[PDB]
Amino acid sequence: MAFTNYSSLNRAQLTFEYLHTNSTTHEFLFGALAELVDNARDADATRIDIYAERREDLRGGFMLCFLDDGAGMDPSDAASVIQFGKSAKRTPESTQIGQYGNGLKSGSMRIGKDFILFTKKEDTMTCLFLSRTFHEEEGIDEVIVPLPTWNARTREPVTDNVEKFAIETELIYKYSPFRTEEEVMTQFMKIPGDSGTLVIIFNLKLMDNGEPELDIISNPRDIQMAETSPEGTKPERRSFRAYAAVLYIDPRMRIFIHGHKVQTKRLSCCLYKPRMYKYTSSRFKTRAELNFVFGVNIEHRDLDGMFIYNCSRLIKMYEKVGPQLEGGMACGGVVGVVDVPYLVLEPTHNKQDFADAKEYRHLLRAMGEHLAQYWKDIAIAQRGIIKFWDEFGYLSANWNQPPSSELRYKRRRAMEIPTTIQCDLCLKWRTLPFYPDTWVCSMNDRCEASEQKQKVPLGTFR
Amino acid sequence: NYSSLNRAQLTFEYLHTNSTTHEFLFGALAELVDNARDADATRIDIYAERREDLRGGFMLCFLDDGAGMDPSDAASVIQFGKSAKRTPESTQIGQYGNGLKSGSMRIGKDFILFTKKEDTMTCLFLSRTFHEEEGIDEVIVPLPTWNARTREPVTDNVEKFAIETELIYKYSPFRTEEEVMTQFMKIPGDSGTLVIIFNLKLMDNGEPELDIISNPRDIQMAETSPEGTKPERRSFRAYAAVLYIDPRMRIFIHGHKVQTKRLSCCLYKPRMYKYTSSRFKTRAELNFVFGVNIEHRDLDGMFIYNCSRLIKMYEKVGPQLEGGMACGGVVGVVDVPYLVLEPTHNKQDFADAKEYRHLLRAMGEHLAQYWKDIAIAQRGIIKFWDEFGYLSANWNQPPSSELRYKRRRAMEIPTTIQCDLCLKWRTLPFQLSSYPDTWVCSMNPDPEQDRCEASEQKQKVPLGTFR
Ligand SMILES: Nc1ncnc2c1ncn2[C@@H]1O[C@H](COP(=O)(O)OP(=O)(O)NP(=O)(O)O)[C@@H](O)[C@H]1O
Ligand SMILES: Nc1ncnc2c1ncn2[C@@H]1O[C@H](COP(=O)(O)OP(=O)(O)NP(=O)(O)O)[C@@H](O)[C@H]1O
Ligand SMILES: [Mg+2]
Ligand SMILES: [Mg+2]
Ligand SMILES: [Zn+2]
Ligand SMILES: [Zn+2]
């Protein structure tokens, strides 16, 4: 469309320090990790394995590896990775979470100094090496990223510039944890399917005490934050397992941390007397309703608040709205969930907030109004608040104190919330009337049975 | 040699991506204000040039008299991450080489920057409209330089300069070299910068996100003021007033100076609690100033500054987290050096959440210490507050405007004021009727500090001790 040529004009160029600048957006390391998990999901990965390869010769002592069997990346897609702001996912009606062409870079540079990405597709295996260590050691102001490609069957380099490929592979072997083509190929074989991605973030960030920010020792099945948990802390904020469990409102991709599947869950289904309220979005209709799902978290009443999902991705968690902002038990314990499309509210640079604060607060006020409506609809006054709560084992006067673990109260709580579960093979969510490692439809029903989704009672506002 | 290797390159959409970090449009503006400050500007004028042919209806202009930029610096503007400010023992607020771009792209589609210095005047045109209209996936930024004396182009590629100026005239609000030179002459001094963000963002209702009509002396958010909303979040005037813990640069919004203030000076019974941050020495201490906001009890909470720049404000810590009135109304201030905590991408949070929470817990402990020290609750918190005019029970209601109360409050808080000539912060002994006028040192009744050469008497804040 340009009327002339702009080859001689200056271009806005990235610098090695802008990688750290980009990383600083993640005050939530779990958001930084969620960026890679979102990339894996958008890659149509059926599972993402988030494990740690111990490496004492690397800062932090271990590499953080995100292995997914998604669509992978061809050489052109891998090149487009380092095209900041480029996102083929940013398309109308897209269900993909990536739109900013920035999540992978920001999250990886927040988690660790460098990240080496191995991706595989139809007939090509590409390694993307974003080595901040390389830049620091060689005084590179630009952001140079080797992108060697091999033929996935012959392992022969697929390139037009042999010298370019040689330099790329030499840099990878020199500054990466994989010092030989044999090690590079070994990391490529960790993608067993025809396509998949293996994002390895190494030289992790260290706290002031020299230890990594991510604690993987206190719980080998979890990636925790290396920091003492005050009773007021939220598992989704101190435990990456808990965070990834509710990281998506419609979790299809399985998430494994250190080889142990994360029991992904739908708060829409894990609640007592859930109810959907339709809210008409003037912005949504102008650019084209929302579904405010409310329910009492009987299992843990202190883990209440609104869980705002944006394009099925968790942005705001435990967001207190409506009467919850007051001092009192009114609407205490009620959990709200909403999947906000991108036409309504877009996420922030770190995808831990919403760019349009005005409309985000409008949504929060609407959700508070609907939360009060839900509280009236369930009409706990018909029962009474204290009697209602102690019915589920909350005998203690304390609010954050978990309910008594008597089998009576356990059955009382469980009898109301159906125990949904995802099949490890067909990825569909099932139900049972009345497991950590694995489960399939046959263990009630079969993998071909249509997904009988949770139909929620519909309420109305006013 | 790595000339053959791929380079991580920016894309036009990355401008919006970078902009999305600013969920606080006032933080987006504060980015440009911080750039002006770092430029050693003694004055930044944040005015609105009405332009109905541009999206938003008006142009947002940030005119400063700082050091300006030479052609090399202007080129380094579009080098994302490039920041010469990022140096040790540096009072500069810029470190990320990103603030200008993120803030400008959050505020509006495009921004045209006019900077002047030694005899070279440079115009940086980051036109997202240009890229949208001509299908550029890159980020092409014209950077023509003229000789500030002869206004003759200073360039090596005449065709490059011609293309740059053509793009500026074609996609910018200034369609002629005459208009460009007018905007350059808006920098009267030998050096200065004029950042004009135009094609502003529009809310759903089609109006700009910034309200410059409700109060012609302020840049408000075009959105109602819920009682809970803070002036620093609905009024850029107040936000810029408390935007720096040590304000030197004068902020003028629409031509009217912003009455910059130091909460340290503007508090009752201020006390400096020194906190020895182990992180400071580990990465190699802080000063937690606490005071009761007698004028506005509800405007309490910690005001955490980072390198003299406001990051977190009204941050409830310590007993304030409890619903009780303990430590209610106490404002806290801390200028966190960059060595201790660094800010987030948007400069509205802190990158190290763990250590930021450690600092918040320390500030809460020191806040309880200050509460006990002043012993106002010991003598009776309700009577203490109603003595200053809060005879009512609602914590959000302001104090009674009776002159008796007004005097009771103003007596405790000494009145400080900045001279509009030497930028030195003077303190006066009696109540002042006055918006910020053109007050200068010469008009100070106190003879010890009736001069612009008189040394600035810094505040003699008492130093408390913890434990
Ligand atoms: N695991 C993966 N599998 C397949 N493609 C991937 C993977 N990770 C990254 N990519 C590709 O690389 C691009 C850049 O990643 P990223 O920096 O996360 O930007 P984005 O995902 O497009 N958008 P956002 O997540 O909103 O910043 C993606 O958009 C994908 O095209
Ligand atoms: N008003 C100004 N006066 C002088 N120099 C300026 C001005 N605005 C920008 N610059 C220069 O342009 C650079 C880029 O600005 P910016 O994108 O704000 O990055 P930064 O200010 O270096 N760091 P940060 O503000 O933390 O992102 C600055 O660092 C200055 O060198
Ligand atoms: Mg992504
Ligand atoms: Mg700046
Ligand atoms: Zn199945
Ligand atoms: Zn003076």
Numbering used by the authors:
A (entry chain B): 1 to 288, 365 to 510, 519 to 528, 534 to 551
B (entry chain A): 5 to 288, 365 to 514, 519 to 551
Original paper wording:
The Microrchidia (MORC) family of chromatin-remodelling ATPases is pivotal in forming higher-order chromatin structures that suppress transcription. All MORCs share three features: an N-terminal gyrase, heat shock protein 90, histidine kinase and MutL (GHKL) ATPase domain, a central CW-type zinc finger (CW) domain, and a divergent C-terminal domain (CTD) with predicted coiled coils (CCs). MORC2 possesses multiple DNA-binding sites that undergo structural rearrangement upon DNA binding. Importantly, MORC2 mediates chromatin remodelling via ATP hydrolysis-dependent DNA compaction in vitro, regulated by the phosphorylation state of its CTD.
We determined the structures of MORC2PD and MORC2 ATPase domain with (MORC2PD-DNA, MORC21-603-DNA) and without DNA (MORC2PD, MORC21-603), in presence of AMP-PNP, at overall resolutions of 1.9, 2.5, 2.4 and 3.2 Å, respectively, using cryoEM. We performed electrophoretic mobility shift assay (EMSA) with MORC2WT and MORC21-603 in the presence of IRDye-700 labelled 10, 14, 19, 24, 29, 34, 39, 44, 60 and 90 bp double-stranded (dsDNA). Both constructs of MORC2 bind to dsDNA longer than 29 bp. Interestingly, almost all CC1 was missing in the DNA-bound cryoEM structures indicating high flexibility of this region upon DNA binding. Upon overlaying these models, we observed no conformational changes within the ATPase domain. In MORC21-603, we observed a significant increase in deuterium uptake in the ATP lid upon DNA binding (peptides 81 to 109), indicating an increased flexibility in the ATP lid region. The presence of DNA with MORC1-603 also reduced deuterium uptake in CC1 and nearby regions, transducer-like and CW. This suggests CC1 and nearby regions form a high-affinity DNA binding site, somewhat consistent with previous mutagenesis of the CC1 loop (point mutation of R326, R329 and R333) that prevented DNA binding. The observed flexibility of CC1 inferred from its absence in the DNA-bound MORC2 cryoEM structures and crosslinking mass spectrometry, suggests that CC1 may aid in binding and compacting DNA.
